[PDB]
Amino acid sequence: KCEQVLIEKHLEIFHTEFQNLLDADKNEDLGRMYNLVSRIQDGLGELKKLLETHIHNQGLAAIEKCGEAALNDPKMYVQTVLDVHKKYNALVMSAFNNDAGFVAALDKACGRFINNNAVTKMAQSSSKSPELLARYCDSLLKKELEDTLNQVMVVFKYIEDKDVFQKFYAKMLAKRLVHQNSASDDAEASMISKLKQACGFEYTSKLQRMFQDIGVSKDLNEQFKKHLDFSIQVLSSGSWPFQQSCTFALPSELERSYQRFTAFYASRHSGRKLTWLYQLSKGELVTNCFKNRYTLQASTFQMAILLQYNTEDAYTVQQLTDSTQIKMDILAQVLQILLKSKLLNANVDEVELKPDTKLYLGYKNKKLRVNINVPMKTEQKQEQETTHKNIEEDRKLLIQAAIVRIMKMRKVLKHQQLLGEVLTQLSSRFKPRVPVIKKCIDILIEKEYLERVDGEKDTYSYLA
């Protein structure tokens, strides 16, 4: 009775106060109000709805505040998201006493405004969040820190698109393994152990396969050096996401290493060759003609281009093209980087490279050893869309395989049930669309996998 006279009659008056207590940080007031409203029956749904609305509004405001910066900066956005998530979690635990019905509200709210936000609208795709997460993870892994990994793992559960994130993480791990610049093995082991619980088993098996492949490369290299300033990695194309290297002619000084090792391979393995890759290769050269000795690192194409400067002063781009065998786009991309490096006009950036057009005696730097290998200006975007297309193709193939295996078991299945089985079987990975699932049935049908039953359409049967 008392609860009906001191709380019930004024519930509306309390409601307007709730928002007033959310704008300003007052944990004691929220706790007292929750304790008061707990005694009342069916009087908590409105509070949960208001809390969810406030959480969504605050998240949208935070994401919009850092607009036009989160697209290429996966650090600040992730930091803000984690800070907001932890703040809300602490507020719920302390004020609401970690109520069962309130933790779900925050979970659904996060799952709602993480996928869709200003970044998603600007990028015109919901896969930007996993991309930023993968980039941030790679940044942390590449050169006390376990707290961030746990935060990323717990917040990652709200991400619906997991295949894109897994593919990006695999690509980053492969890139880091190819170019040895990792921080420590303990961090990698901890990350693998943490991902074992979240990700499935195929991903872990592939990562272990890559690890053993690189180990075999390392011990083969050490055995080769023992048998005899030259290290080459031998990896498997099937278990590593790398494409075939384009046409390229080896220089003179590097020819010897290409021959002897090949012979060493002939006596070790038969029926298999090696596909040398140069886009990922690197080297180092030393010069002394300057006022001081310089020890600089570069890529294979860069050393090949420079190594043409013996017995010459200046060149034409075409002789370069016909002597180095490099495509015009890559040749121009390398040449503009070299010009920016002040190693080879009014202005170097954004100046046309005209096939008709030497090294300048300069490049005065305080550091004895200087690294010039840097990512290209546009290769990042090209890699982005090509990886996105590959992921889309893999998703389509996986959907086709799932449909085929579902229909194999059932001799004759309805069209409606078939789309529920496909959605529920792959829901853990992604949420395929219905316009997208339709095409695949047609392609399967076009390839004689299935037959719409003769009596009526929208019933499919499996015919061998």
Partner 1 sequence: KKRFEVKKWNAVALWAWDIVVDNCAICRNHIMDLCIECQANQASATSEECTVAWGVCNHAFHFHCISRWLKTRQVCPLDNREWEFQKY
Partner 2 sequence: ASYHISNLLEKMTSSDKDFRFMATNDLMTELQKDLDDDSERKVVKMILKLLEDKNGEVQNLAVKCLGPLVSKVKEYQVETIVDTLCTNMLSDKEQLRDISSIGLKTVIGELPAANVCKKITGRLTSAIAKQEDVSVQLEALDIMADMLSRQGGLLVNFHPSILTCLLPQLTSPRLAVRKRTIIALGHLVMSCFVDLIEHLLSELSKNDSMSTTRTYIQCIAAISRQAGHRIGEYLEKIIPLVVKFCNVDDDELREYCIQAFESFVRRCPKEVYPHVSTIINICLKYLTDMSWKVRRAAAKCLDAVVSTRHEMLPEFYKTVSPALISRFKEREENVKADVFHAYLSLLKQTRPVGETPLTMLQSQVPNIVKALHKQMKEKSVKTRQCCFNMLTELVNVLPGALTQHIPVLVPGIIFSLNDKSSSSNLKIDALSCLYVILCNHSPQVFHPHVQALVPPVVACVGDPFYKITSEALLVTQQLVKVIRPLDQPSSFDATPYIKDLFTCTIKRLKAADIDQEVKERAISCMGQIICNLGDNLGSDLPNTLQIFLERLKNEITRLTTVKALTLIAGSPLKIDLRPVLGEGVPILASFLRKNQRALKLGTLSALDILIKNYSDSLTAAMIDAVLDELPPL
Report residue 127: phi and psi, to 5°. -85, 0
- Contact region for partner 1 (CB under 8 A) — 24-32, 266-274, 320-328, 371-379? 266-274
Q: Does 275 interact with partner 1 (rule: CB under 8 A)? A: yes
452 DSSP assignment: E
311 binds partner 1 (CB under 8 A): yes
Q: Which is nearer to partner 1, 311 or 347 (CB)?
A: 311
From 76-84, 277-285, 381-389, 421-429, give the range in contact with partner 1 by CB under 8 A: 277-285
Smallest distance, partner 2 to C-beta of residue 196, A: 7
Nearer residue to partner 2 within complex by CB, 63 or 155: 63
Per-residue x/- track, 415-434, partner 2 (CB under 8 A) = ----------x---------
For position 464 contacting partner 1 by CB under 8 A, the verdict is yes
- Give the integer Cα–Cα distance in Å for 430 and 163: 7
φ, ψ of residue 294 in degrees (nearest 5): -115, 135
Q: Binding partner of residue 269 among partner 1, partner 2, none, CB under 5 to 8 Å per kind? A: partner 1
Q: Using the rule CB under 8 A, is 260 a contact of partner 1? A: no
And the tokens for 183?
């921080």
Choosing from 14, 242, 248, 462, the residue that interacts with partner 1 (CB under 8 A) is: 242
CA angle 270, 229, 252 (to 5 degrees): 75
Task: Rule CB under 8 A: say whether 409 interacts with partner 2.
Answer: yes
| Contact residue for partner 2 among 2, 100, 147, 201 (CB under 8 A) | 201
Alpha-carbon gap, residue 412 to 407, rounded angstroms? 8
For 154-201, give the DSSP string: HHHTT-S--HHHHHHHHHHHHHHHHTT-BS-HHHHHHHHHHHHHHS-S
Residue 421 buriedness (CB in 10 A; 0-12 / 13-18 / 19+): middle
Of residues 233, 323, 325, 336, which one binds partner 1 by CB under 8 A? 233
For 308-377, strand residue ranges (E) read: 369-371
Six-digit token pair at 443? 């392609």
Per CB under 8 A, contacts with partner 1 among 128-167 are none
* Residue 409 beta carbon to partner 2: minimum distance, rounded to whole angstroms: 4
# of chain residues touching partner 2 (CB under 8 A) = 25
Token code pair at residue 266: 């002939």
250's contact among partner 2, partner 1, none, with CB below 5 to 8 A by partner kind, is: none
> CA angle, corner 401, sides to 397 and 406, nearest 5?
150
The binder of partner 1 chosen from 50, 285, 330, 423 (CB under 8 A): 285
Residue 282 in contact with partner 1, rule: CB under 8 A: yes
Q: Is the separation of the CB atoms in 136 and 75 below 8 Å?
A: yes
| Residue 140 or 170 with smaller CB distance to partner 1 | 170
Closer Cβ to partner 1, 237 or 416, answer by number: 237
Q: Which span (64-72, 96-104, 345-353, 365-373) binds partner 2, by CB under 8 A?
A: 64-72
Give Dmax over CA atoms of the chain in angstroms.
103
d(CA 283, CA 306): 12
Q: Which of 404, 413, 426, 444 binds partner 2 (CB under 8 A)?
A: 404
Chain positions 80 to 119 lying near partner 2, rule: CB under 8 A, are none
Tokens of 222: 């050490």
Compute CA distances 377 → 75, 303, 326, whole Å.
Answer: 21, 20, 18
Which of partner 2, partner 1, none interacts with 3 (beta carbon under 5 to 8 A by kind)?
A: none
Separation CA 104–CA 86 (nearest Å): 15
Which C-beta is closer to partner 1: that of 109 or that of 399? Answer: 399
Based on the shown chain and the rule CB under 8 A, indicate whether residue 44 belongs to the binding site for partner 2.
no
438 binds partner 1 (CB under 8 A): no
37 binds partner 1 (CB under 8 A): no
Which of 326, 407 has the CB closer to partner 2?
A: 407
Asked if 19 interacts with partner 2 (CB under 8 A), we say no
Contact in structure between 400 and 422 (CB atoms under 8 Å): no
CA distances from 231 to 139, 204, 217, 223, 365 (A): 26, 28, 10, 11, 29
Residue 232 engages partner 1 in binding (rule: CB under 8 A): yes
Binding region for partner 1 (CB under 8 A) out of 116-124, 193-201, 252-260, 411-419? 252-260
Coil, helix or strand for 461?
A: strand
The reply on whether position 360 binds partner 2 by CB under 8 A is no
Pairwise CA distance, residues 4 & 14, whole Å: 14
d(CA 388, CA 446): 26
Judge residue 65's burial from the number of C-beta atoms within 10 Å of its C-beta, 0-12 exposed, 13-18 middle, 19 or more buried: exposed
**Judged by CB under 8 A, does residue 253 bind partner 1?**
yes
Interface residue list for partner 1 (CB under 8 A): 178, 206, 229-242, 253-254, 257, 269, 271-278, 280-289, 300, 303, 306-307, 309-313, 359, 390, 393-394, 396-397, 442-443, 446-447, 464
